[PDB]
Design an enzyme around this catalytic site. Structure first.
Site, PDB file in Angstrom:
ATOM      1  N   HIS A  52      -6.868   4.214   6.171  1.00  0.00           N
ATOM      2  CA  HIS A  52      -6.096   3.966   4.961  1.00  0.00           C
ATOM      3  C   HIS A  52      -5.501   5.220   4.325  1.00  0.00           C
ATOM      4  CE1 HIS A  52      -4.668   1.274   1.931  1.00  0.00           C
ATOM      5  NE2 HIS A  52      -5.357   1.830   0.953  1.00  0.00           N
TER       6      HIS A  52
ATOM      7  N   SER B 220       0.800  -1.226   0.000  1.00  0.00           N
ATOM      8  CA  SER B 220       0.000   0.000   0.000  1.00  0.00           C
ATOM      9  C   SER B 220       0.834   1.279   0.000  1.00  0.00           C
ATOM     10  CB  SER B 220      -0.929   0.020   1.221  1.00  0.00           C
ATOM     11  OG  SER B 220      -1.998  -0.895   1.082  1.00  0.00           O
TER      12      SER B 220
ATOM     13  N   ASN C 179       1.620   3.717  10.577  1.00  0.00           N
ATOM     14  CA  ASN C 179       0.793   4.228  11.654  1.00  0.00           C
ATOM     15  C   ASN C 179       1.046   3.415  12.904  1.00  0.00           C
ATOM     16  OD1 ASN C 179      -0.791   2.109   9.997  1.00  0.00           O
ATOM     17  ND2 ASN C 179      -1.940   2.154  11.926  1.00  0.00           N
TER      18      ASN C 179
ATOM     19  N   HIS D  46      -5.109  -9.229  -1.581  1.00  0.00           N
ATOM     20  CA  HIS D  46      -5.341  -9.569  -0.180  1.00  0.00           C
ATOM     21  C   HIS D  46      -6.538 -10.480  -0.020  1.00  0.00           C
ATOM     22  CE1 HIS D  46      -3.685  -5.517  -0.685  1.00  0.00           C
ATOM     23  NE2 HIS D  46      -2.995  -5.707   0.426  1.00  0.00           N
TER      24      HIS D  46
ATOM     25  N   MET E 159      -2.260  -7.205   6.862  1.00  0.00           N
ATOM     26  CA  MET E 159      -3.189  -8.166   6.267  1.00  0.00           C
ATOM     27  C   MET E 159      -2.671  -8.776   4.968  1.00  0.00           C
ATOM     28  SD  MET E 159      -6.314  -5.433   6.599  1.00  0.00           S
ATOM     29  CE  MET E 159      -6.708  -4.624   8.184  1.00  0.00           C
ATOM     30  N   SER E 160      -1.354  -8.903   4.841  1.00  0.00           N
ATOM     31  CA  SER E 160      -0.761  -9.450   3.614  1.00  0.00           C
ATOM     32  C   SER E 160       0.594 -10.087   3.885  1.00  0.00           C
ATOM     33  CB  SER E 160      -0.552  -8.315   2.610  1.00  0.00           C
ATOM     34  OG  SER E 160       0.481  -7.448   3.062  1.00  0.00           O
TER      35      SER E 160
ATOM     36  N   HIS F 245      -2.803   0.561  -4.823  1.00  0.00           N
ATOM     37  CA  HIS F 245      -2.286  -0.613  -5.532  1.00  0.00           C
ATOM     38  C   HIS F 245      -2.651  -0.407  -7.004  1.00  0.00           C
ATOM     39  CE1 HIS F 245      -2.331  -2.074  -1.416  1.00  0.00           C
ATOM     40  NE2 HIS F 245      -1.559  -3.077  -1.798  1.00  0.00           N
TER      41      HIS F 245
ATOM     42  N   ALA G 103       2.781  -2.034   4.071  1.00  0.00           N
ATOM     43  CA  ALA G 103       2.505  -0.927   4.965  1.00  0.00           C
ATOM     44  C   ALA G 103       1.978  -1.669   6.190  1.00  0.00           C
ATOM     45  CB  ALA G 103       1.426  -0.040   4.378  1.00  0.00           C
TER      46      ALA G 103
ATOM     47  N   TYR H  35      -8.783 -10.258   2.213  1.00  0.00           N
ATOM     48  CA  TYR H  35      -9.976  -9.466   2.499  1.00  0.00           C
ATOM     49  C   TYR H  35     -10.700  -8.942   1.256  1.00  0.00           C
ATOM     50  CZ  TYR H  35      -6.870  -5.341   2.021  1.00  0.00           C
ATOM     51  OH  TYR H  35      -5.975  -4.407   1.552  1.00  0.00           O
ATOM     52  N   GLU H  36     -10.067  -9.050   0.088  1.00  0.00           N
ATOM     53  CA  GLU H  36     -10.693  -8.613  -1.164  1.00  0.00           C
ATOM     54  C   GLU H  36     -11.606  -9.730  -1.657  1.00  0.00           C
ATOM     55  OE1 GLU H  36      -8.135  -6.417  -4.142  1.00  0.00           O
ATOM     56  OE2 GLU H  36      -6.567  -7.137  -2.795  1.00  0.00           O
TER      57      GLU H  36
HETATM   58  O1  IMH Z   1      -2.684  -0.824  11.686  1.00  0.00           O
HETATM   59  C1  IMH Z   1      -2.796  -1.607  10.733  1.00  0.00           C
HETATM   60  N1  IMH Z   1      -3.456  -2.849  10.844  1.00  0.00           N
HETATM   61  C2  IMH Z   1      -3.669  -3.780   9.796  1.00  0.00           C
HETATM   62  N2  IMH Z   1      -3.239  -3.518   8.571  1.00  0.00           N
HETATM   63  C3  IMH Z   1      -2.594  -2.338   8.388  1.00  0.00           C
HETATM   64  C4  IMH Z   1      -2.029  -1.816   7.170  1.00  0.00           C
HETATM   65  C5  IMH Z   1      -2.064  -2.532   5.706  1.00  0.00           C
HETATM   66  N3  IMH Z   1      -2.477  -1.543   4.719  1.00  0.00           N
HETATM   67  C6  IMH Z   1      -3.873  -1.740   4.313  1.00  0.00           C
HETATM   68  C7  IMH Z   1      -4.660  -0.756   5.235  1.00  0.00           C
HETATM   69  O2  IMH Z   1      -4.078   0.537   5.471  1.00  0.00           O
HETATM   70  C8  IMH Z   1      -4.092  -3.267   4.480  1.00  0.00           C
HETATM   71  O3  IMH Z   1      -3.835  -4.033   3.267  1.00  0.00           O
HETATM   72  C9  IMH Z   1      -3.057  -3.707   5.591  1.00  0.00           C
HETATM   73  O4  IMH Z   1      -2.337  -4.912   5.250  1.00  0.00           O
HETATM   74  C10 IMH Z   1      -1.469  -0.623   7.443  1.00  0.00           C
HETATM   75  N4  IMH Z   1      -1.644  -0.315   8.835  1.00  0.00           N
HETATM   76  C11 IMH Z   1      -2.360  -1.417   9.339  1.00  0.00           C
END
Ligand code: IMH
Ligand code: MG
Length: 280
Positions: free
Chosen positions: A255, A31, A241, A84, A217-218, A62, A114, A86-87
């Site tokens: 996001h 991401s 974050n 992913h 989540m990947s 993406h 990310a 989740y998609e």
């Molecule tokens: O705090 C978080 N928890 C879970 N996923 C993400 C992500 C990743 N980026 C996407 C959501 O921002 C998603 O594909 C996840 O794998 C960034 N920060 C976090």
């Protein structure tokens, strides 16, 4: 699974016949990390939609393109955007490209993503080398290797304790030192969960207690398939974050800010990755 060995072959042969590029390294851009393709020379792009059997990227940040090119004198192929669970994709679809890359002649896979920081010492913008992972969906049986094993790719019971190449992580640290960066290259354990919702405070505390340093989540399914088929693996998370850890905080994961962080770190990440090419 659902793909036959020939399906992967078909796709690989299709690519080999549509470009002169012959990559030895594959990079999966997470991401907001699509900018990693920016400095590739003699680049050739293929939208995922034009490649037989390839899934589609539906998540913002993406691009959904496969870019072949040369990076620091190294022939590479980059997944500008990934897939992913989740998609709605089963892991055998999410990881389809990994086996295609192996059939192209690729030997090393670099995974990026990310991720939310669980280690309190992490700061947004930090780069964390993935030293190990925790596969939560795998605990339940959700695994790209589930089903009959294709011996032409790998063994029935692959080991994962040495998934993230030790040598490459040593070079990663050496290389980071040459960059003269303010922050130190972080290193830790990445835990993968399904998503798409961001974590609750209770989940965040629990995940940290499992020994995880970053959450996403990947990535993990891609690494498992990579190791199964013999690819050397290296990877890192961009801490986009800091996951909310208490009920008094007014913060909230989103996001949009994840994508913003990726853009702010894109430059530094590009140099790091390019420098690393020389290490492979
Ligand atoms: O705090 C978080 N928890 C879970 N996923 C993400 C992500 C990743 N980026 C996407 C959501 O921002 C998603 O594909 C996840 O794998 C960034 N920060 C976090
Ligand atoms: Mg060309």
């Amino acid at each position: 699974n659902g793909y036959t060995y020939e399906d992967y072959q078909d796709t690989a042969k299709w690519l080999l016949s549509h470009t002169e590029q012959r990559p030895q390294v594959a990079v999966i851009c997470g991401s907001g990390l699509g900018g990693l393709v920016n400095k590739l020379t003699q680049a050739q792009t293929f939208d995922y939609s034009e490649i037989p059997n390839f899934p589609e990227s539906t998540v913002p940040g993406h691009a959904g393109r496969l870019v072949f090119g040369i990076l620091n004198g190294r022939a590479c192929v980059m997944m500008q955007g990934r897939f992913h669970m989740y998609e709605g994709y089963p892991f055998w679809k999410v990881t389809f490209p990994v086996r295609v890359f192996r059939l192209l002649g690729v030997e090393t896979l670099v995974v990026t993503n990310a991720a939310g920081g669980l280690n309190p010492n992490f700061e947004v913008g930090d780069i964390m080398l993935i030293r190990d992972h925790i596969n939560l969906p795998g605990f339940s049986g959700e695994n790209p290797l589930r089903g009959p094993n294709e011996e032409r790719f790998g063994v029935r019971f692959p080991a994962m304790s040495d998934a993230y190449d030790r040598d490459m992580r040593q070079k990663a640290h050496s290389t980071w030192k040459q960059m003269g960066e303010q922050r130190e290259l972080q290193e830790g354990t990445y835990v993968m969960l399904g998503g798409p919702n961001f974590e609750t405070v209770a989940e965040c505390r629990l995940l940290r207690n499992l020994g995880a340093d970053a959450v996403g989540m990947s990535t993990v399914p891609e690494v498992i398939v990579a190791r199964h088929c013999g690819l050397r693996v290296f990877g890192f998370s961009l801490i986009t974050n800091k996951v909310i850890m208490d009920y008094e905080s007014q913060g909230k994961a989103n996001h949009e800010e994840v994508l913003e962080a990726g853009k702010q770190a894109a430059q530094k990440l590009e140099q790091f990755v390019s420098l690393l090419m020389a290490s492979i």
